[PDB]
């Protein structure tokens, strides 16, 4: 996955804190972290609650987790948090192509390509890159910005070896969707 | 560098735009980008102005750029922009150590290590990782959070091969700075 979210918790406060994930709670001492990234299916990550020892305050986490990515959930007293982006769940294989999408529409866009998802790419913003084996890839774009009758199926060009591309999503002259491809110098990250 | 900033410009609007960098101007047609990442010394990146054809509006990029990182400057009509982080300027060599810093102080912190900089890491926040060859590394931490008389020089432990670490910065019992090292699962990107 693809569809899996990896989360590590790092307690940077001065007391014991608990993060309640669906089906599993982790209590950490101050100045300590979970030894591993815990893995979840995005659809099963319904809510995340954070609490502190003694303090009755329970805080719910703003669902800012991207599938296919690792995150560090920073926690501190009194029930404070910050989600830090830690990059991809998997190291891209030699020869894979990095693809990111840029949304120029006034509504969010979701892109699904070869089992990978770029969810709710905001207006005039870029997603991070995700990596794919070479060759033409089919993908879909779903948004409220265009008529439901508009074409949602697209195809990437013949992806070279180890390249990186930015796919810019815009309105076509007929009012539907169009994608312009740009080659970028490969990311080092 | 290290102390270098890489910037590519991508015009995602519907008209011609100009980006004035110190000593060099780039004019882009709609749906076009600069063919390369232009490189600048952070200290020499005094200001960046963005303008559109016909529209008298000139916008200054007050938004920061991180040294040692690549960026995509997204531009669109009338004089809009967004700085997108594209990762590191250099691909980490096999065996290098990814190191990031977490600031738990109430003031921003700046860390300088082996020619690399982590500038203004905000309160209860993490920097991205930067990579270094193996062995003990000397580093400095400068902040307004502690007395100027406090020790600002630190040393990393004898760091292993391909190992990643998070250095958590906190106030020591004597009122000065203290750093706790955590080993991490190495980042993939």
From Swiss-Prot, chains A, B:
Impact upon substituting residue 125 to A: Does not affect trypsin-binding
Family assignment from sequence similarity: Belongs to the major facilitator superfamily. Proton-dependent oligopeptide transporter (POT/PTR) (TC 2.A.17) family.
Keyword Transmembrane helix carried by entry: yes
Compartments where located: Apical cell membrane
Subunit structure: Interacts (via extracellular domain region) with trypsin.
Single GO MF descriptor: peptide:proton symporter activity
Domain notes: The extracellular domain (ECD) region specifically binds trypsin.
Its biological purpose: Electrogenic proton-coupled amino-acid transporter that transports oligopeptides of 2 to 4 amino acids with a preference for dipeptides. Transports neutral and monovalently charged peptides with a proton to peptide stoichiometry of 1:1 or 2:1. Primarily responsible for the absorption of dietary di- and tripeptides from the small intestinal lumen. Mediates transepithelial transport of muramyl and N-formylated bacterial dipeptides contributing to recognition of pathogenic bacteria by the mucosal immune system.
GO terms (BP aspect): dipeptide import across plasma membrane; oligopeptide transport; protein transport
Topological region Extracellular: 1-189
Protein name: Solute carrier family 15 member 1
Annotated spans, Extracellular domain (ECD): 1-189
Positions annotated as glycosylated: 16, 49, 125, 142
Organism for this UniProt entry: Mus musculus
Annotated Gene Ontology cellular component terms: apical plasma membrane; brush border; membrane
Keyword entries, A-Z: Cell membrane, Glycoprotein, Membrane, Peptide transport, Protein transport, Symport, Transmembrane, Transmembrane helix, Transport
């Amino acid at each position: 996955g693809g569809n899996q979210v990896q989360i590590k918790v790092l307690n940077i406060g001065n007391n014991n804190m608990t993060v309640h994930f669906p089906g599993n709670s982790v209590t950490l001492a101050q100045m300590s972290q979970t030894d591993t990234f815990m893995t979840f299916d995005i659809d099963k990550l319904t809510s995340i609650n954070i609490s502190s020892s003694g303090s009755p305050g329970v805080t719910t986490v703003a669902h800012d987790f991207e599938q296919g990515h690792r995150h560090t959930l920073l926690v501190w007293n009194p029930s404070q948090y910050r989600v830090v982006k830690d990059g991809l769940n998997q190291k891209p294989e030699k020869g894979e192509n990095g693809i990111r999408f840029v949304n120029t529409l006034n509504e969010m866009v979701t892109i699904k390509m070869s089992g990978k998802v770029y969810e709710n790419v905001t207006s005039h913003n870029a997603s991070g890159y995700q990596f794919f084996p070479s060759g033409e890839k089919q993908y879909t774009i779903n948004t409220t910005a265009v008529a439901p009758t508009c074409l949602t199926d697209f195809k990437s060009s013949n992806l070279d070896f180890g390249s990186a591309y930015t796919y810019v999503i815009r309105r076509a002259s007929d009012g539907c969707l169009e994608v312009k491809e740009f080659e970028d110098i490969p990311p080092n990250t």
